[PDB]
């Protein structure tokens, strides 16, 4: 019914300690409403939690945007003989994304309680949190929060006056972006290289240690405890239909005040940047391009970002996709092709090398983009590069090939004249 989104009240946010000003510790969390009526949520049943998540309209906050209730119900099959596990993905690999880090460092207890609630909903025996290897202080804070929860009896032996036993383990990665991918996450947990496995089987069938597993983003896990307490309907109302809820937006690049802020879902991009980022550097007329959902999403120019919303459907209709809600802005004083080439170079150093399309094609793309930056190529190559991207995309084991091909496609589609001009200039200066 509502038509305008982006005015979210201060009291109406979920991460009330996003900036780490309140005492995050267990005492502070309780003061902010955390660990309230957990037993009531545990005792009410897993089916009730799954129904609340379904009616909440919640979708994966990681990037895919898949309905989380559907996955957690995929777990809801009866027992098999194997233990069931809930793995929380805290890899936080994507460039320009810092949301997971802030809600782990300054607010761990909501993550722990969401882990417990999701484990109860999915019948999981324990929770494994794969924290990034670089996030050492964040991991230590999460560990001490888990220790505090264990001391208070909030997790572990009976975990409550409930009768449900649940453990929360924290495992640390070692410098690997591919380990963020859920199957590569599982492989890294099991002590092998972070190479993704094929699907099927899905983690709900054969996951960590061969046991049924559900992998969820840190942001997705945190909202569930609050969602259960305030109800599915309250969460559903925000944003548009099939895009319900509130989202954490990380605005960076060429802005006056780069910041992480939680806001309503279908907020206009320009309104969000002006309100929270302080506006783009040099005024809105200085803007050249925006990458809305981290490096794995195609860029959009000013004419598209003028009147574009921020959710899955609208950003897909803009041929970008929401992704990880990671806004990176670029004004007209920066080399856009250099930025895209740097992204492709990053993807070249972050591929696991398992399958030939991603490995060979992404190395080829990096070399081609390096040649493009100097204009050393010819115009007829541009279409060739496009075809390369098409070949790599949809033929790989995991979606890292997609995340390497899409930026190239967006750059070509929106700035082919720039590449042709650079090539012509190189030809002139070299004869």
């Amino acid at each position: 019914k509502k038509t305008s989104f982006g005015s979210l009240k201060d009291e109406d946010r979920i991460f009330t300690n996003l900036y780490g000003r309140h005492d995050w510790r267990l005492k502070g969390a309780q003061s902010r409403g955390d660990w309230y009526k957990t037993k009531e949520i545990l005792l009410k049943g897993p089916d009730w939690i799954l129904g609340e998540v379904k009616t909440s309209g919640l979708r994966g906050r990681g990037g895919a945007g898949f309905p989380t209730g559907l996955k957690w119900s995929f777990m809801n099959k009866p027992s098999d003989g194997r233990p069931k596990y809930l793995v929380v993905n805290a890899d936080e690999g994507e460039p320009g994304t810092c949301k997971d880090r802030e809600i782990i460092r300054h607010d761990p207890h909501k993550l722990v309680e969401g882990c417990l609630v999701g484990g109860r909903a999915m019948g999981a025996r324990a929770a494994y949190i794969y924290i990034r290897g670089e996030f050492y202080n964040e991991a230590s804070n999460l560990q001490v929060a888990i220790r505090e929860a264990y001391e208070a009896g909030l997790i572990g032996k009976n975990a409550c006056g409930s009768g449900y036993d649940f453990d929360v383990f924290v495992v640390r990665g070692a410098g690997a972006y591919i380990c963020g991918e859920e199957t590569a996450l599982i492989e890294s947990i099991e002590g092998k290289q972070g190479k993704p496995r094929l699907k099927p089987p899905f983690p709900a069938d054969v996951g960590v240690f061969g046991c049924p597993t559900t992998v969820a983003n840190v942001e997705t896990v945190a909202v569930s405890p609050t969602i259960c307490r305030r109800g599915g309907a309250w969460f559903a109302s925000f944003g548009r239909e099939r895009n319900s809820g509130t989202k954490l937006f990380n605005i960076s690049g060429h802005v006056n005040h780069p910041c992480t802020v939680e806001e309503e879902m279908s907020v206009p991009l320009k309104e969000l940047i002006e309100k929270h980022a302080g506006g783009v550097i040099g005024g809105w007329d200085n803007l050249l391009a925006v990458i809305p959902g981290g490096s794995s999403t195609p860029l959009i120019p000013k004419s598209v970002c003028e009147t574009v919303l921020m959710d899955f459907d609208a950003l897909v209709q803009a041929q970008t996709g929401l992704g990880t809600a990671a806004v990176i802005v670029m004004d007209r004083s920066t080399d856009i092709v250099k930025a895209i080439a740097r992204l492709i170079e990053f993807y070249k150093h972050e591929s696991c090398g398992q399958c030939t399309p991603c490995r060979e094609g992404v190395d080829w793309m990096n070399k081609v983009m390096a040649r493009f930056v100097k204009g050393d190529a010819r115009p007829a190559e541009i279409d060739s590069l496009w075809e390369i991207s098409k070949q790599i995309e949809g033929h790989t084991i995991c979606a890292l090939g997609d995340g390497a091909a899409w930026p190239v496609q967006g750059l070509i589609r929106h700035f082919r004249p720039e590449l042709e001009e650079r090539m012509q200039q190189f030809a002139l200066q070299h004869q």
Binding site: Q193, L198, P200, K348, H349, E350, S351, C352, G353, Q354, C355, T356, P357, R359, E360, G361, V362, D363, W364, K367, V368, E381, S384, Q391, I392, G394, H395, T396, I397
Partner: protein, 230 residues
């Protein structure tokens, strides 16, 4: 019984549950292109040369690892599957070395034959190729590492059949290499078979090097007498 009906090119076939798309195509008489899949080894899915189109599905599936579903109509000679094969073959040949005249696997190369029957007839690769250093794993298997396509057949055979965990992949992405990471000889009574399973000239026979071409050889079926297995 428990057989399910699947269609390969519009033709009905009855298969067991868990049968892969590749085996369903086999039962009708087609061989799907492959480099990493082997019947005797565990499924890998690395090569992506088995990608085939399932009708009314936008994404191609790996035939060597995807179990067939009831009522599925595989489209093996569809335009999408042919384009996927050409793209994968292009990626495979982008970094491959121009070693065919000096390679001991000239007329017995799966890479060559599958390029001829499923790839394109030309290249659009304008960059420079890569080169990795060779490894020494004993006097029986000659290793020329640049030719290797990272199929991982040798690793799976060593770990599962020979029972030896000496072979592995080191590094990441484009620079990932198959070897031992240390100077160590892979020696076992079953060590030579990795020459046969290797589709390329990365692993060749050392005593047999440079002596003959496959089209010249006359093949005589006979029996081993070095033991009582026969």
């Amino acid at each position: 019984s428990n057989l399910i009906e699947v269609f390969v090119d519009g033709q009905s076939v009855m298969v067991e549950p868990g049968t892969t798309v590749l085996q369903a195509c086999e039962k009708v008489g087609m061989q799907i292109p492959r480099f990493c899949y082997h019947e005797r080894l565990s499924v890998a899915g690395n090569c992506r040369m088995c990608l085939v189109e399932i009708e009314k599905a936008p994404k191609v599936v790996a035939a060597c690892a995807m179990p067939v579903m009831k009522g599925w109509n595989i489209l093996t000679n569809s335009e999408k599957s042919k384009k996927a094969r050409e793209g994968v073959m292009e990626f495979l040949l982008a970094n491959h070395p121009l070693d065919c005249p000096i390679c001991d696997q000239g007329g017995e190369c799966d890479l060559q034959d599958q390029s001829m029957m499923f790839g394109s007839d030309r290249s659009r690769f304008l960059e420079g190729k890569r080169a990795v250093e060779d490894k020494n794993i004993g006097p029986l298997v000659k290793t020329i590492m640049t030719r290797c396509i990272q199929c991982t057949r040798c690793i799976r055979f060593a770990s599962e059949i020979a029972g030896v965990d000496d072979l592995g992949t080191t590094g990441r992405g484009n620079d990932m290499q198959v070897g031992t990471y240390i100077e160590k000889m892979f020696m076992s009574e079953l060590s030579g078979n990795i020459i046969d399973i290797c589709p390329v000239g990365a692993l060749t026979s050392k005593p047999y090097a440079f002596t003959a071409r496959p089209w010249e050889t006359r093949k005589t079926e006979s029996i081993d007498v070095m033991d009582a297995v026969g």
